[PDB]
Amino acid sequence: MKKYRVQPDGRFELKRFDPDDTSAFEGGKQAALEALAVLNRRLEKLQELLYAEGQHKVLVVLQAMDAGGKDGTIRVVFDGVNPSGVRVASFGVPTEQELARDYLWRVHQQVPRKGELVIFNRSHYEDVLVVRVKNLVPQQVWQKRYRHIREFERMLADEGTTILKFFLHISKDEQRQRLQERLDNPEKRWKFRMGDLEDRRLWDRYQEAYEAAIRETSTEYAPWYVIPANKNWYRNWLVSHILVETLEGLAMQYPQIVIE
Amino acid sequence: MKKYRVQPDGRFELKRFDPDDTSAFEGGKQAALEALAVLNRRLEKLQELLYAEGQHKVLVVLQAMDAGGKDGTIRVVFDGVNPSGVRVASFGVPTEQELARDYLWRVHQQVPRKGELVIFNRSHYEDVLVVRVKNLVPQQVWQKRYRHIREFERMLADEGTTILKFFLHISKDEQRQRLQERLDNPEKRWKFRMGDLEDRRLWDRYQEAYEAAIRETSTEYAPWYVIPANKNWYRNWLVSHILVETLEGLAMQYPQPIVIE
Amino acid sequence: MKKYRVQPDGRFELKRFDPDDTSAFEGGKQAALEALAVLNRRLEKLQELLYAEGQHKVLVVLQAMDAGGKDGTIRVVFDGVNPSGVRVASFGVPTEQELARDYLWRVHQQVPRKGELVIFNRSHYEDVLVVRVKNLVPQQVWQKRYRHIREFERMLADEGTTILKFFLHISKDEQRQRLQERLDNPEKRWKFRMGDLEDRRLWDRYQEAYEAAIRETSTEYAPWYVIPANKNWYRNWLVSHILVETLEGLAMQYPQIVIE
Amino acid sequence: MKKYRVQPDGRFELKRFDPDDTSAFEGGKQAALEALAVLNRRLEKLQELLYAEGQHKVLVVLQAMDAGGKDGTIRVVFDGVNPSGVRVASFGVPTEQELARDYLWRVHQQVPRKGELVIFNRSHYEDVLVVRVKNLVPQQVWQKRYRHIREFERMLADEGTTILKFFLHISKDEQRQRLQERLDNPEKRWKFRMGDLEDRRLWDRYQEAYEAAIRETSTEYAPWYVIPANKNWYRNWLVSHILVETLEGLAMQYPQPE
Ligand SMILES: Nc1ncnc2c1ncn2[C@@H]1O[C@H](COP(=O)(O)OP(=O)(O)O)[C@@H](O)[C@H]1O
Ligand SMILES: Nc1ncnc2c1ncn2[C@@H]1O[C@H](COP(=O)(O)OP(=O)(O)O)[C@@H](O)[C@H]1O
Ligand SMILES: Nc1ncnc2c1ncn2[C@@H]1O[C@H](COP(=O)(O)OP(=O)(O)O)[C@@H](O)[C@H]1O
Ligand SMILES: Nc1ncnc2c1ncn2[C@@H]1O[C@H](COP(=O)(O)OP(=O)(O)O)[C@@H](O)[C@H]1O
Ligand SMILES: [Cl-]
Ligand SMILES: [Mg+2]
Ligand SMILES: [Mg+2]
Ligand SMILES: [Mg+2]
């Protein structure tokens, strides 16, 4: 499953990853759901170790094109995981208070504490994504941010954070269908804003911004994983597999008279 | 079912509530687990609505004697509920930073935002519970806090927060059993604190504190519910039933705001 | 003196206070500057004691019509007072993050800690002032906020905060000059916004809103002081006098071997 | 006066700086007080411009041995500077909440916003000073923090923060005198705690930690200035001079009318 980890060699090409690829799983939807159920139970048990051990900090970063599966991933991968140990931090349009400090200030506040698993639904990456695509700052400014990010993540990792960054990779046609389904669904119509169409006109610019971001910031201490995400069953299984394998590697353990 | 809601008449008596009572459910463990499963799936759907609508703020307060079932309630009642819309805020021993401001400062920071459901695992109530029982401040100080709490909760309710306060009611013997079990299971021995034996010695002073707190702060806008909690199946079913009924009462609606090329 | 303290009898009338009144000081500008210098030194010494003792919390609330003297007051009254123990919290246009919680959430965060003196340059009062005048919430909502404020302040006072609320009272004509002077001064033009003309146009609505807010919230534990503020020398002297006397009343004490 | 700026060449030696040196000022205490009053007035005007312009963020870091003059510097250098635009963030013993996140979390929280001047009375540097001296984390951990600090400061500078870091340099004998004076003055005894004496026993370890920290983190974007601080008048004048010169270099402008 190591074929999805982006090596720190600055030679990453997004074209080498197909959103419709399901090659790491030897079967289809039904076999994958059973396999996911097994991983989800292991994940619940690994989160229990993390929380009780209270040493490690786990950071899961989710990034994708609009309708790329960020909410779906959280919902399904973390299903049944103790709410006391799992937290979501969503990053939207910066406020005036947030813009008055460096772009990393609002992000650094939300980092996981010891024994905690945090999911960034969007992140500090938006500052080299939407900011780059829509030229919210000049190139001279945002080009320097790749180093800021590598060094911020190095500090986090050195200080005890396990970082997993998932790029949920969907195709242009898959986004068109998901966006259309969001229009033609009254319980999902709320997720759709008009702005989702302008970001859609900028598809290629966003793909280029993603490629450069992933190429510049995938490191040994903070890897990027490209998740083919056109098939939700595959996306959910693969994210769970990578997460569970990473947590297993930490080799966490539980810590070390008659009541009247 | 809402015979468990404490009326704002200042006549609340904890003796009228039996921790072993299961009278609101016409059956036992197995039927209640099926009933809970149904409520849990309704809760998942009601949370999706709350988040989507993004107007209401939901605050669930959990208070109990040690080993009274606070963690158990969170894990079971909120099982499968989207992590993006549900948050737990735990209140422990105040830090120097927290003590340097009023007791409500650390609590007010954690309140739910619009479209969010927040669980207070312990709360601002500890400032009329452990503080009163262990005399951390004089009576002159903590007696004034019942009003502070009523008025803080009124402000929260008026400004859009739906407040549900659950007192998970267990018996003295049930506590004896639960701490003993926790002090035996090696995967749970980490939960046990030596301080739990001094708090058990003050059982009666904590029961009196709870009675006073519940009597003083159960209001129309922020009710207290006494949950008989010796039977976990009953405690989980009843908390889910009360929560689901409350969210259904909000009559939440999905927002309403072309061919993609 | 106590002639400026608004009694908690719900009979407050702003008309009884003249912005041009200087009756509490037996002299003019020059004698009051010397008197202010004496109070300012006492204030520096009282702040040093407050910080050292580290037990009391002091909250100074400043409210006024636009150009009413809030900045001028901070600058002059707190001149030379140690920056380590004096903090300003300015309340501007609420952000989306701030609006997503109750109006008191952003305000409660900024309250003074033990040994600290905090100045609210605008405050939670804006939630019964601009909010009321411009109908940012319905009357049914903001009318309930007077009680919220009394009860919030009661809690603060009961828990150890000394609360002083100053309404810097200027006349309509004094504001017209000050606003105009702000337009004509290139080192002050930045303070002017087009919205200030809308706020000037609503003078009477704001005066009504101030009268109702002062009448509803001036209590024994959190008094309002109406400061005639057309004369800056008088405004600065009177605010310093009230503050110094209040801090002296606290009877603060300093907390209580050969080096090799 | 560029003799006090630590060049980014990794060759810094604290022994080359005398706490009793006053060579940059051609006079004594009384002429310096007048000179300081002139600089203080310029500083009040530069702060007004910073706040009005609302674009730059100014970070002043103060580090010293105990009784080295951090509070005195804040009090005198920033005397009369508008409280609305100047803020002090003091860094003490980390709480359990603070220790549960990386050491930079509590520090990053306090960084200046646009139009603001912030003074760090102690800072993120403590995490390579007291932490190193008392081995609160192993060497393997704190040795990596010099890079974290350079890169955190680079990010801050690139994103619009002007950083000035002042090491207020006093001698071992000056600290003995000042610590004694603190125990004898009843309005200053509160500043003294017993721990300050074990910190004095560890004088040499702290001097080595300071030398290493300054050598590792003095950069073009975030320089360290060694301030001979045995003479308060000289320390106050020199810090004001460096600060005023730095702010003047920003060539701040009042906002363009609407
Ligand atoms: N740093 C940033 N700068 C500008 N816009 C940002 C930044 N971070 C996030 N955003 C934007 O905030 C929006 C969040 O969208 P939203 O509908 O609330 O959530 P999501 O689409 O992830 O479910 C996106 O349009 C995203 O581009
Ligand atoms: N306001 C407060 N003042 C004093 N102690 C408090 C306060 N709030 C909470 N506590 C105490 O903090 C402790 C939290 O216990 P902990 O083991 O961390 O969690 P829990 O037992 O709820 O699982 C309890 O002993 C509780 O009495
Ligand atoms: N609660 C609030 N709701 C709406 N607007 C607010 C609120 N609090 C403050 N404001 C507004 O924020 C603005 C702050 O103005 P600004 O020019 O930044 O400062 P000031 O005029 O006090 O020097 C004012 O127009 C004020 O009415
Ligand atoms: N990162 C840190 N780790 C450990 N101790 C720290 C840290 N930061 C600051 N401290 C300690 O906190 C204490 C603050 O001392 P205090 O008397 O409150 O202030 P000061 O001496 O600066 O006036 C010092 O002993 C300092 O070493
Ligand atoms: Cl699917
Ligand atoms: Mg969207
Ligand atoms: Mg204005
Ligand atoms: Mg904000």
Ligand SMILES: [Mg+2]
């Ligand atoms: Mg000290």
